[PDB]
Amino acid sequence: GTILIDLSPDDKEFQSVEEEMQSTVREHRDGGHAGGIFNRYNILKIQKVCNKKLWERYTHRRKEVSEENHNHANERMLFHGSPFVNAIIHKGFDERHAYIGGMFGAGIYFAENSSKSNQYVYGIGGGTGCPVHKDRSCYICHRQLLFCRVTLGKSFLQFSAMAHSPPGHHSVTGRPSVNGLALAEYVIYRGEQAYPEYLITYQIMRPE
Ligand SMILES: O=c1[nH]c(-c2ccccc2)nc2ccccc12
Ligand SMILES: [Zn+2]
C-alpha cells in the first residue's frame, strides 16, 4: 500500500529537505573510506512516502511514548541509510533493519549528519561499494537515503568517541565526544518509532 509522490524542485518542501541533506554533510574520520569523498550531493529526486497503515502504526506508538513522557514525543527528522531501503518503504522498519553490531546495541540507527547515513547505503562500512563498479566512492551510481520522522521520547544520553531500550527510556542518543564537528546519532529499539517520510535519490559529487 505504499505510493511514492515526486516533489517538484520548485516546492518549498523539496527545497527544505534538500537543504537538510546538503547542510549536514561533514568530513569523516575514515577519510572517505566507507561513504566516498565529497562535500555535497547532486540531488536527483525527492519523493514523499505515503502509506496509511505504516503512518497509523507510527502515530499510535508516538502517542504511547508521548503519554509516558509528559506529552512529549520528542520527534526529530533524521537520516537513515540502508541496503534495505526498498523493504523499509513498503513494509516499515522492523528488527531486520537493525544494526546488530552497533555501538549502542542492536537497534535501528539514525543520524543528523546525512553524510553519516550515506556510509551505510551500500552496507556496513560501505560494504563493497556500488553494485556496478564496486566503488564505495562511486560518483556515477544513484544512491538513496531516507529522511525519517523518528520518535525519541525519553532518550538515554551516551557520551562517546533487537535489544531493548535502557529501562525507563524510549531511545539512546549518541553524543559525540571527540570529533567536534560530528552531530548526534540516535537508536530506537521498536520499528514503530520511525516513519520513512522522504526517499531521496542522489549522487555524491567529486570535489574540485
Ligand atoms: O543511517 C544509518 N544506518 C545504519 C545501518 C546499519 C546497519 C544496517 C542498516 C543501516 N547505521 C547507522 C549508524 C549510525 C548513524 C546512521 C546510521
Ligand atoms: Zn558505481
Side-chain angles (χ1 to χ4, degrees):
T2 289
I3 69 164
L4 308 179
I5 306 292
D6 284 35
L7 297 181
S8 166
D10 298 338
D11 187 340
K12 67 183 174 175
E13 199 182 340
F14 182 105
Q15 285 154 27
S16 61
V17 175
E18 170 163 7
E19 182 59 19
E20 265 303 273
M21 183 80 174
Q22 302 284 15
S23 64
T24 63
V25 172
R26 64 172 174 87
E27 281 178 328
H28 288 269
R29 289 186 296 159
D30 74 354
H33 182 87
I37 297 167
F38 62 96
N39 302 310
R40 69 203 166 101
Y41 310 107
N42 177 42
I43 301 300
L44 295 161
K45 185 187 285 297
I46 299 180
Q47 297 159 298
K48 177 65 144 292
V49 178
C50 312
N51 189 310
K52 187 146 181 302
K53 164 142 193 253
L54 294 181
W55 179 249
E56 287 166 11
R57 183 187 294 172
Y58 174 71
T59 56
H60 182 268
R61 176 54 184 170
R62 178 170 72 183
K63 180 183 176 282
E64 288 178 347
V65 171
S66 184
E67 292 180 352
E68 289 173 2
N69 196 52
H70 45 83
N71 306 309
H72 179 39
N74 197 19
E75 179 179 271
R76 310 296 175 83
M77 299 291 297
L78 300 168
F79 296 98
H80 186 75
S82 182
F84 313 124
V85 58
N86 204 72
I88 292 159
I89 67 184
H90 293 278
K91 306 296 189 164
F93 286 103
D94 61 45
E95 61 286 325
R96 300 184 315 273
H97 312 130
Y99 185 10
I100 300 310
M103 291 178 74
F104 312 113
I108 303 152
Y109 281 68
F110 299 83
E112 286 171 9
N113 285 122
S114 63
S115 59
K116 185 77 212 166
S117 287
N118 174 76
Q119 293 185 309
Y120 295 86
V121 157
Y122 292 129
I124 297 163
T128 44
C130 68
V132 173
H133 302 82
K134 310 291 158 186
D135 186 357
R136 280 182 299 269
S137 190
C138 192
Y139 299 111
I140 299 157
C141 293
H142 288 185
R143 300 176 185 220
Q144 297 188 308
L145 274 180
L146 297 170
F147 190 45
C148 305
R149 193 173 293 270
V150 184
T151 286
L152 297 177
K154 192 181 157 40
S155 198
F156 184 93
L157 192 64
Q158 184 68 251
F159 294 71
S160 187
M162 210 148 171
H164 295 117
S165 218
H169 295 80
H170 301 97
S171 66
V172 169
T173 296
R175 178 254 179 79
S177 90
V178 295
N179 185 349
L181 303 191
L183 303 178
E185 296 171 18
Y186 304 85
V187 188
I188 64 175
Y189 303 91
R190 305 272 308 269
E192 312 92 305
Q193 267 165 241
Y195 183 85
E197 212 157 305
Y198 301 90
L199 178 65
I200 305 164
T201 307
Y202 67 101
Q203 292 161 315
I204 58 166
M205 288 181 72
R206 189 189 298 266
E208 295 181 51

